[PDB]
Write a protein that binds this DNA or RNA. Structure first.
Length: 73
DNA sequence: TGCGACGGTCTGACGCTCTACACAGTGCCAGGGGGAGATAAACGAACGCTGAACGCTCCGG
């Protein structure tokens, strides 16, 4: 079973791989002595991957609150 | 040519509502052509003013 931690970890890994591709493309077209850690990395893929996981996914489900038993189940 | 078999191709895979949701990482400005809106004038029209003018009942000396 992929629990909640492993699923969110996989989504963060996909976002970070996209970020690594973006930063590779950035450093292939950038000069040295003008690179700052605040600049060459972009957090947009990570947040986009997380938000695309928590919504419109078959795993992150709208919790049913009919009764406590349904919540636990 | 006959042979299997190898492979691609192609199809659907009972029914409805109660429910039912939305969608994400990389340039920049100058010169030039059109039409939207404000402007002040214009040719023509009819819109008013001029009371005048025709005709009526009229109270009348």
């Amino acid at each position: 079973i992929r629990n909640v931690g492993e699923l969110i970890q996989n989504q963060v890994r996909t976002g970070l791989a996209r970020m690594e591709r973006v930063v590779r493309e950035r450093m292939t077209t950038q000069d040295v002595e003008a690179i700052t850690p605040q600049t060459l990395i972009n957090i947009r893929p990570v947040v986009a991957s997380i938000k695309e996981f928590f919504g419109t996914s078959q795993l992150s489900q709208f919790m049913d609150q009919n009764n406590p038993l349904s919540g636990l189940t």
